[PDB]
Amino acid sequence: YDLPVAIEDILEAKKRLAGKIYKTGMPRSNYFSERCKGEIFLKFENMQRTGSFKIRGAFNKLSSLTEAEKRKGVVACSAGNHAQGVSLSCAMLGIDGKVVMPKGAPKSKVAATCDYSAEVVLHGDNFNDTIAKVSEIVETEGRIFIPPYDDPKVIAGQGTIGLEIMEDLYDVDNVIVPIGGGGLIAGIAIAIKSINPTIKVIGVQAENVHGMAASYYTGEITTHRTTGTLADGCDVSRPGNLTYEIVRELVDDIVLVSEDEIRNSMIALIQRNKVITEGAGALACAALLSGKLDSHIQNRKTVSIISGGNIDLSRVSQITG
Amino acid sequence: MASHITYDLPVAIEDILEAKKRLAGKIYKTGMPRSNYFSERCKGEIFLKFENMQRTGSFKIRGAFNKLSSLTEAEKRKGVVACSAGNHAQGVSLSCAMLGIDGKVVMPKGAPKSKVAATCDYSAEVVLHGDNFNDTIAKVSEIVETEGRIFIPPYDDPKVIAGQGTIGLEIMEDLYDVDNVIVPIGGGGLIAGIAIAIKSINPTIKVIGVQAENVHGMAASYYTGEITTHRTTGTLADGCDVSRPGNLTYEIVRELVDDIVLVSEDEIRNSMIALIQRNKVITEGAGALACAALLSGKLDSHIQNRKTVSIISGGNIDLSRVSQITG
Ligand code: NA
């Protein structure tokens, strides 16, 4: 009955985002609709600022802070998209931001975050080293940590996508969503379920690593990870506390897609729809082509989220070659 | 403005309405989202019409389909013919498959294999012949006189123009308060169709054309008052590599098109880089033309604090070429 985020938080976020972050395209897809024997629409969060949706939740958090909180500075850790989302937000709001990264994060991602204003700190040869440094920085400098998903405002920001979907297409039947730590689907599901709960919200993760999926099937929080994935944005072994709480209550299903199916989805998106997607941005479309949603999607209206496009063209060519 | 176009120009709002009906449930409305990068850069609201995501990878399906569909069954049973190195070939070829029509497409012996493959995959017979358009166009008329196939012009035809104009109707539906529409010009079919649709509905909307500095037949004609050839050399916007505009298109353009601006190869390249890197959409050179004009500063007096639609006309370019043109 009681959840840690409500429609009001997403309506508050809408208002903080009003005139700053903007609605992305959601066109009917020719290729996917023919393939899937139903109407497939593609939500372009890859074309949101910074190249992923992460700006939304990050902008809501950072601007819902008090001046007393903004003076404290802020801090995060990421090798890609979250780093970029907080940085643009830190420039936009003029908040002093620092961002920790491992000592081998893509050079394209390492400059993109500096250009966006925030100070990059390269440190350690793994992800847990990054978190070790953040804890030290918060401890010593007194900066506000910006969670990539497990935060009510972050989730609220993300939810603004759900409003956009129903605003553009409110005879939508299905919404298909990628999951890492769980903020995108959490936000989206609250927005959708609060306004039209008969719209089915379906999650997607890689077979290689799916903490949230494992938690969703288990009934409590648990880890799952064997190896990495092409959907690197969703390489998250253990799902968030707030996010799992919401997903278990509101998400109608979570499906798993293989690496080959992620690749096939990337190929179709760039080749047959002309949109640049990274692996995590192709997860939802992977699930459509897999055949695992056919009974949900056939002769119905289905929205597939393109969560990000931060991938080097050479890597696209490698995968879609 | 509706009645003046009807009475005085060779294509009218009625033709566009006929086309919308023929395309109904076969060709669908492409997206038209606001662009973050271009709005920031232009200090105004920029919307991107994604004909690169239309069937075949460009808008040319609209005109080809409207034309082929408009034929009597007697005409359809004669079969059709066309020549193209890419986008028109694909449009004619798919339209032939959708309508059950017997098509024959002549392509130069040296077109990008991907385009040749795509035209084949559909339905039409691909006749590879000659190293240029003059060679391929020469082979077409032989086919016309020998086999009696109906020729499908790429732009200078009232059904083809009407077909393209359905784009104008979709812009009005999605964005009734649009101020500007920026449109690439090869032969002028796309902009002719859009100009008729837009101006017949709300004539206070500006329709502005774009061509490469390297080849701009329509621009030269426009500014000369006479059909005129222009070509210095080839362009990245190869889809608009047309040295002499159509007769019907020039007539329509010189009445309804507010201006035509020219953009350099650097500007075209910059626009492609922006569309792919900053907006995550694949565009071929011609599909980048309108966006090139916006970023060049050459439309600064029209777009600040306004609503402006940029036509992304096509996305038919090999990912390998996108890589070497871009970063
Ligand atoms: Na003029």
Side-chain angles (χ1 to χ4, degrees), chain A residues 3-33 35-36 38-66 68-70 72-87 89-102 104-106 108 111-120 122-124 126-199 201-269 271-319 321, chain B residues 1-6 8-20 22-25 27-39 41-108 110-112 114-130 132-138 140-205 207-325 327:
Chain A
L3 303 180
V5 277
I7 188 58
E8 292 85 10
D9 300 303
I10 301 170
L11 287 178
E12 286 170 14
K14 200 205 176 165
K15 213 170 284 156
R16 298 193 192 77
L17 274 59
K20 297 126 190 176
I21 290 162
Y22 291 90
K23 182 169 68 169
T24 55
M26 199 169 81
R28 185 186 194 282
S29 171
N30 289 306
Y31 183 75
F32 282 85
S33 291
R35 289 299 316 278
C36 295
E39 302 204 67
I40 311 290
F41 302 78
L42 311 175
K43 183 63 161 170
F44 297 139
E45 295 303 301
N46 57 333
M47 307 184 193
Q48 189 56 268
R49 288 166 73 71
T50 74
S52 82
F53 69 90
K54 285 207 164 70
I55 190 67
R56 293 175 183 262
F59 180 66
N60 194 38
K61 183 61 170 191
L62 281 145
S63 95
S64 76
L65 295 171
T66 57
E69 286 166 349
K70 289 173 191 170
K72 307 199 204 190
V74 304
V75 56
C77 53
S78 161
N81 291 353
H82 174 77
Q84 291 178 1
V86 303
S87 196
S89 297
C90 279
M92 287 176 80
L93 295 160
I95 299 167
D96 185 348
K98 201 180 289 175
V99 181
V100 189
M101 309 192 163
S108 56
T113 53
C114 288
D115 293 318
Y116 280 140
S117 85
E119 174 179 359
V120 174
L122 282 88
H123 176 91
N126 67 57
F127 177 64
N128 298 130
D129 292 337
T130 338
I131 301 161
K133 190 66 183 175
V134 170
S135 79
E136 190 194 324
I137 289 167
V138 171
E139 282 274 318
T140 55
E141 307 179 11
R143 283 172 181 257
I144 300 294
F145 171 71
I146 307 305
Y149 45 86
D150 213 14
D151 186 291
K153 295 266 191 297
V154 169
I155 296 162
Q158 265 54 294
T160 55
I161 293 168
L163 305 171
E164 287 175 12
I165 294 176
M166 295 177 295
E167 193 188 307
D168 289 339
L169 184 73
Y170 222 156
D171 57 337
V172 61
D173 296 296
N174 311 309
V175 184
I176 316 301
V177 189
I179 306 166
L184 179 65
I185 196 154
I188 293 167
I190 295 145
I192 293 303
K193 295 312 200 179
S194 303
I195 304 188
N196 191 335
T198 66
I199 303 173
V201 179
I202 300 174
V204 188
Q205 291 203 290
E207 289 169 353
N208 281 351
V209 48
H210 50 251
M212 181 65 74
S215 297
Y216 182 79
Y217 311 143
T218 292
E220 81 174 13
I221 291 166
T222 39
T223 305
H224 179 275
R225 185 175 195 281
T226 69
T227 182
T229 175
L230 289 176
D232 56 299
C234 291
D235 189 346
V236 175
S237 73
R238 202 177 168 84
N241 301 310
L242 291 77
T243 52
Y244 170 61
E245 187 172 353
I246 298 149
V247 166
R248 58 171 271 100
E249 188 62 24
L250 303 181
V251 172
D252 296 289
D253 210 355
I254 299 175
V255 299
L256 304 181
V257 293
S258 77
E259 296 301 295
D260 290 296
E261 294 178 323
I262 293 166
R263 168 177 286 105
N264 295 348
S265 170
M266 289 180 60
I267 289 162
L269 270 161
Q271 213 166 86
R272 288 299 206 112
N273 228 109
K274 310 300 180 172
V275 306
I276 300 295
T277 196
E278 69 182 84
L283 275 172
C285 280
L288 301 171
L289 298 180
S290 62
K292 293 153 196 185
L293 301 169
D294 279 2
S295 58
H296 295 89
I297 69 193
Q298 281 191 42
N299 303 307
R300 302 267 280 279
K301 311 202 175 188
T302 300
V303 169
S304 180
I305 308 293
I306 314 302
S307 43
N310 292 335
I311 182 174
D312 293 322
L313 227 40
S314 71
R315 198 179 160 189
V316 171
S317 304
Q318 200 176 47
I319 295 162
Chain B
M1 187 57 66
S3 290
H4 162 75
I5 290 166
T6 298
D8 309 325
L9 293 174
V11 184
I13 187 55
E14 289 90 348
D15 302 302
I16 316 313
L17 296 182
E18 277 172 19
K20 191 198 188 191
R22 291 195 201 78
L23 272 68
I27 304 305
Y28 292 86
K29 173 168 73 180
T30 58
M32 202 179 82
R34 183 189 188 270
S35 160
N36 286 317
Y37 186 67
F38 289 85
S39 293
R41 292 281 316 280
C42 298
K43 306 189 190 157
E45 293 201 289
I46 306 297
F47 301 93
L48 304 174
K49 184 56 167 180
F50 291 142
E51 294 301 301
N52 62 326
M53 308 179 187
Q54 181 55 266
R55 299 165 73 86
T56 75
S58 98
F59 69 88
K60 291 199 159 66
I61 190 75
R62 292 165 183 275
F65 195 81
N66 192 56
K67 173 52 174 170
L68 292 153
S69 188
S70 70
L71 298 177
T72 52
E73 206 55 33
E75 282 154 18
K76 285 169 179 179
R77 288 190 289 99
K78 289 199 179 88
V80 306
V81 62
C83 50
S84 167
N87 288 347
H88 186 60
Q90 291 178 43
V92 174
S93 184
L94 180 49
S95 287
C96 282
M98 296 177 75
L99 283 161
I101 299 168
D102 193 334
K104 199 157 179 164
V105 175
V106 191
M107 317 186 69
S114 59
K115 299 172 178 280
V116 171
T119 307
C120 282
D121 290 344
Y122 301 127
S123 60
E125 195 201 311
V126 172
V127 177
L128 294 170
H129 180 261
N132 58 69
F133 169 78
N134 275 21
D135 298 329
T136 58
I137 196 74
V140 172
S141 278
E142 173 175 13
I143 290 160
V144 171
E145 302 303 307
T146 57
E147 309 181 44
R149 290 172 179 281
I150 289 165
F151 175 71
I152 309 292
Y155 50 87
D156 211 23
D157 185 293
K159 301 285 178 285
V160 173
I161 290 156
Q164 318 317 18
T166 54
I167 296 168
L169 299 176
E170 291 164 17
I171 294 162
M172 297 319 296
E173 196 197 20
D174 300 338
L175 199 64
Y176 86 99
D177 53 337
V178 63
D179 303 302
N180 307 297
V181 183
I182 320 301
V183 187
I185 308 179
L190 175 65
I191 200 164
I194 291 172
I196 295 159
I198 294 280
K199 299 290 209 187
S200 297
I201 294 169
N202 186 331
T204 65
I205 296 161
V207 180
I208 298 181
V210 190
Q211 294 199 290
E213 285 173 7
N214 281 4
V215 53
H216 50 252
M218 182 66 80
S221 301
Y222 189 88
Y223 294 118
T224 300
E226 190 172 49
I227 289 178
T228 309
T229 296
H230 182 278
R231 187 169 194 281
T232 307
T233 183
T235 178
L236 283 174
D238 57 296
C240 292
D241 185 351
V242 184
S243 64
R244 190 168 178 89
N247 293 316
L248 304 182
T249 54
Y250 171 58
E251 188 178 351
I252 295 155
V253 165
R254 68 201 196 85
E255 186 59 38
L256 306 175
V257 167
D258 290 86
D259 204 45
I260 304 182
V261 292
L262 308 177
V263 291
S264 65
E265 298 301 292
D266 272 6
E267 288 166 341
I268 294 160
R269 196 177 290 97
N270 293 341
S271 169
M272 294 175 68
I273 289 168
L275 284 164
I276 306 148
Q277 296 178 4
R278 293 293 215 123
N279 223 122
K280 307 301 177 170
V281 282
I282 298 171
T283 175
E284 68 185 89
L289 270 173
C291 274
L294 289 164
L295 293 174
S296 65
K298 299 169 167 150
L299 303 172
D300 280 11
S301 73
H302 291 122
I303 61 182
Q304 298 179 51
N305 310 330
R306 320 297 299 275
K307 303 190 179 193
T308 303
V309 172
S310 178
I311 312 304
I312 315 309
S313 50
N316 289 328
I317 180 179
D318 285 330
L319 182 67
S320 65
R321 202 179 153 197
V322 165
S323 304
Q324 57 173 15
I325 290 169

